From Swiss-Prot, chain D:
Gene Ontology CC annotations of this record: cytoplasm; nucleus
Family: Belongs to the cytidine and deoxycytidylate deaminase family.
Cofactor annotation comment: Binds 1 Zn(2+) ion per subunit.
Residues of the full protein shown: 41 to 224 of 224
Cofactor(s) the protein requires to work: Zn(2+)
The entry's keywords: Hydrolase, Metal-binding, mRNA processing, Zinc
GO biological process, one term: cytidine to uridine editing
Residues at which Zn(2+) binds: E21, H59, C89, C92
Biological classification of the source: Eukaryota, Metazoa, Chordata, Craniata, Vertebrata
Tissue: Expressed exclusively in heart and skeletal muscle.
Protein name: C->U-editing enzyme APOBEC-2
Active-site annotation: E61 (proton donor)
Amino acid sequence: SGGGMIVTGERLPANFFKFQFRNVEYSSGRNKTFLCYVVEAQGKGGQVQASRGYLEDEHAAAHAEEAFFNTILPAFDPALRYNVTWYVSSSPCAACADRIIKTLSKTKNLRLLILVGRLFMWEEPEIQAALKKLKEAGCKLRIMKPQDFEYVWQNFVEQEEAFQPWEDIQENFLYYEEKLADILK
Amino acid sequence: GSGGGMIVTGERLPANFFKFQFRNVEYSSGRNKTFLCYVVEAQGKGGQVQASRGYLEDEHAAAHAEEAFFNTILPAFDPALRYNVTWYVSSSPCAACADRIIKTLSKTKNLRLLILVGRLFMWEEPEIQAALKKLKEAGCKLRIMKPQDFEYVWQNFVEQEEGESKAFQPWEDIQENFLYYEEKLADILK
Amino acid sequence: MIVTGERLPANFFKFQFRNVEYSSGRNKTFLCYVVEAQGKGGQVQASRGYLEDEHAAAHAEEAFFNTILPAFDPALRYNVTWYVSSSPCAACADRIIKTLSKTKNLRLLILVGRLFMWEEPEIQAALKKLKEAGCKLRIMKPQDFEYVWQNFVEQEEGESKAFQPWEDIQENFLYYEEKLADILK
Amino acid sequence: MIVTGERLPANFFKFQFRNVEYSSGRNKTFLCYVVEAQGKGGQVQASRGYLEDEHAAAHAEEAFFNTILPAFDPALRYNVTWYVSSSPCAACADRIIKTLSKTKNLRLLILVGRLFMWEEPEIQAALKKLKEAGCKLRIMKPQDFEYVWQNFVEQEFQPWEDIQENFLYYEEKLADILK
Ligand SMILES: [Zn+2]
Ligand SMILES: [Zn+2]
Ligand SMILES: [Zn+2]
Ligand SMILES: [Zn+2]
């Protein structure tokens, strides 16, 4: 179904995902960050761990990608296989991509799936090169579809007591799915 | 709206889930059934907020749930953020686990722990009563899970198969248990 | 006036014509321009040229007002026109706004091949303030590329060449034209 | 870039391209130029424009260095080329020399259509001193008029009977004056 977690004042989904859900990836400065996640680890022996949460900052020094591997998921035990899933407003920056690539390369027992609301500086060749290397590192990257936003809303956004799509929730998806596919293949 | 779910079991009755699955048992020295539910809330004064909720479970764990948590779930702590952890276990920690908890609570001052146990693990042992008291000394908050707590864990951790179409079926001695263990923990801690 | 090895227009505008606006570092820069000053008295000045750098410390926008057009004489009215690969960065925008504000007798028209970080709110705010400063910003259409090619690119051999359009020359323009408009007005 | 209602280059270079000083501070100015700056390091600069006035207080030569290229990037090496109707006067030559003297990273090339009062001994002195300052002077060849016509005049060639004869004529005069 979906439980509480993120406490916010915004009531409308469209407003939440368009403002509060924003995660700045500007190559410079220390802007704001936001990121929801899901972790599920399986171990051949009856060992199972599945947590879920989120992280945000008004003026974080490090980007969401960094903070995650620095305080949320510091180390992994070899005996387990992790299936991490991220939900961010846009694709990572060139630098962050490299950081993710070096992490996945050190942790073979870690599978990562990043679902983005839209692409970030997709037209730039630097970003495109980083996304390819990222896909080559085994990191599966996809665009968030209407069902995804609804999922995040009902499962990550705390309620107290019905999701509602907006303007071009479907057209934005299809657009970026095409662009992400062209570059990745 | 009531809750999502990350735990999957074939048990449809909560009375059974909290009797078997939720249970913690040490068969042998390095072979014990572990199970622990938790919630993390971190505020770092500056817009930086952190929140999550998960669980752990093993059938051949070499260590108890309490040890497994601080060794893989929250190994690191952001000195900037103020952590507020809440656990949901079947029974209070043992003498050894209490120490680990105390030593960790001693190291990180930005960490605050709340343990909600379903029952008191061997409260008759004077060694156990000593741990509970020292645990409170370290600043750890201990409480007996109230009937509302079991319902909370059930609707926010256990994945409902039919989505939002099921309430909560408490067991006959759900209150006597709480009341019973509340009196005990009280005498011990104060 | 521009001496290059590239023969095909598509290749030129997609690589050699690129002007990096990355908020940080000292990347490459490129910029073609046109200047026309009129003065009530028979005074007329009309020059045309371009500027480029492999690793410039300042962006094209800066270099222009620091060495190409340092000062303006009040008795004249300038009609400057730029031709760059993408729209300016937030910082550069401010620089352009402060310049236009000091030189009332300066009109600026910036024609861009595409938008840069258009989706970011920081960039959108800068573009509006830019339009409010009197700076007219528009997207380059097929005719524009052809113009720049035949007028700024030195022909391999005087009277022995032609412009060749590329697959998405129209679709790309129509996309950013619609985007720039939405944000601007 | 240049726009005129003259369809024949023979007329454009006879009237419009001409430079005349009616009075002390009122003279018809007109100058075509090209700028090429290389700053060893990937930094390249190139442009081409022109100047024209009907009531200019100064000559085209003065107007250029005072508004067109007031500043010079000490890093870049400048290569300027002018296309004027006549060689500079005694006064203008000095300005040119003084400027060429200040900026050592500047190299000038003046392509004149004819020699401005080459008979004056004062003028012959300026031309020589101009070469001393490192300035390169040359008489516009028939090819030059065609170059300026198809790269400066916004059209849409046609040489005149004496186009070659004039070049040769002033070419010899200029030579005897310098070396
Ligand atoms: Zn980043
Ligand atoms: Zn224990
Ligand atoms: Zn810029
Ligand atoms: Zn003169």
